[PDB]
């Protein structure tokens, strides 16, 4: 219709990992590893119509994420809040305008995917190490698959849910 | 839907 966006902000804080989803800057889902039932929950009524299969799916994603976050937190203590923000902006034609993958540690940018969805900006020498690993392993192409595909598709789904 | 980070730093 007009422009729209989806973003997830994932943080693990020493640790309690938290994930919050936004559509058009409005929070719609949430996961916290401090609650009685660490599990994604809808935050707005229009997400409630998603069947139990959905919630189970993304909850499992979240537990896996907790793991990734400890490995990389401890990793970082090696070379608190670990933050991963990602998502997509789409134009009036519903097509991808811009994709984001931004990794930050303790309030400082660590590595982030450039607008080309192909190359990486890193500042730290250490981030230069990561950039190295990921250039070789094809991390940019992997994330680009999400941002150009699933991210757009889920955003349209959530806009319809509303 | 959220995504798997997949890659490690």
């Amino acid at each position: 219709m007009g422009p729209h966006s989806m973003r997830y902000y994932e943080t693990a804080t020493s640790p309690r990992y938290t994930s919050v989803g936004y559509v058009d800057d409005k929070e719609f889902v949430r996961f916290d590893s401090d609650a009685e039932n660490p599990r994604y929950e809808p935050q707005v009524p229009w997400m409630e119509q998603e069947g139990p299969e959905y919630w189970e799916r993304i909850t499992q994603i979240a537990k896996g994420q907790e793991q990734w976050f400890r490995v990389n937190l401890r990793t970082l203590l090696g070379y608190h809040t670990l933050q991963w923000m990602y998502g997509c902006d789409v134009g009036s034609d519903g097509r991808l305008l811009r994709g984001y993958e931004q990794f930050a540690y303790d309030g400082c940018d660590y590595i982030a995917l450039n607008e080309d969805l192909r190359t990486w900006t890193a500042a730290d020498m250490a981030a230069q190490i990561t950039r190295r690993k990921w250039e070789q392993a094809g991390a940019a192409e992997y994330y680009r698959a999400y941002l150009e595909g699933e991210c757009v598709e889920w955003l349209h789904r959530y806009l319809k849910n509303g | 839907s959220p995504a798997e980070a997949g890659f490690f730093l």
Partner: T-cell receptor, first 110, second 112 residues
Framework: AVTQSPRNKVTVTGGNVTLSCRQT?????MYWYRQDTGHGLRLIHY???????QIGDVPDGYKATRTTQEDFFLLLELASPSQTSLYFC??????????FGEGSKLTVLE | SVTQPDARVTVSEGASLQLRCKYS??????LFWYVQYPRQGLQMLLK??????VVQGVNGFEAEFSKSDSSFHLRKASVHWSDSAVYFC????????????FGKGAKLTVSP
């Protein structure tokens, strides 16, 4: 650098067999596959980290345990002849990119 | 699911190779080729996540993603006796990218 043990094993039906796999190179994802002619590799069980177990395509007759990030075990608690196969452990640090151990050939005899 | 159309292929040493692979998922999945030399485990030869459809691998291998045909054929310009091995197409589904499934494999004999 994925190490699996034993590389060779022979057991009788009803036998108890544990296959061990350890990886030093710090990965999260680990996998157990069997390879058989006519079938390629089929995934039995897999894991994203300590304490996580996910069933593969051919879990029946197998249990698995991921006790540490380094260690992934495959248990055949009551071995049957159909479990005669070549078994591979693998680990990964990137979606779909897997590093394989050298294989464990098992024969189950009646 | 990936399908490779022939369980065994023989080529003459020095000749070109194409090993075919089709996938059955609707949404383009993550795609890979692995090789298994005699008596070893498998080793990744190449992969495709997105972008350029022609991907390069180790040892002169390439593969080509075709959205149209849902295929991902492996090619090599000229094969050597030492390329005799089993080659496996593999896939993981979008949204479950770490669950890797293999095809049945193509046993390549290169005749010297």
């Amino acid at each position: 650098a994925v190490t699996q043990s034993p590389r060779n094993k022979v057991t009788v039906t009803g036998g108890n067999v544990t296959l061990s796999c350890r990886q030093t190179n710090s990965h999260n994802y680990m996998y157990w596959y069997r390879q058989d002619t006519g079938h390629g590799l089929r995934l039995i069980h897999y894991s994203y980290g300590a304490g996580n177990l996910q069933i593969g395509d051919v879990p029946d007759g197998y249990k698995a345990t991921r006790t540490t990030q380094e260690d992934f075990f495959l248990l055949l608690e009551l071995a049957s002849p159909s479990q005669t196969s070549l078994y591979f452990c693998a680990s990964s640090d990137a979606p779909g990119q897997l590093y394989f151990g050298e294989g464990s050939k098992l024969t189950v005899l009646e | 699911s990936v399908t490779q159309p022939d369980a065994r292929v023989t080529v003459s040493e020095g000749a070109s190779l194409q090993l075919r692979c089709k996938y059955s998922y609707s949404a383009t999945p993550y795609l890979f080729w692995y090789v298994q030399y005699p008596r070893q485990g498998l080793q990744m030869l190449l992969k495709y996540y997105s972008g350029d459809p022609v991907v390069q691998g180790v040892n002169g291998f390439e593969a080509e993603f075709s959205k149209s045909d849902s295929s991902f054929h492996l090619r090599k310009a000229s094969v050597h006796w030492s390329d005799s091995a089993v080659y496996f197409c593999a896939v993981s589904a979008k949204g479950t990218g770490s669950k890797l499934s293999f095809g049945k494999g193509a046993k390549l004999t290169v005749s010297p």
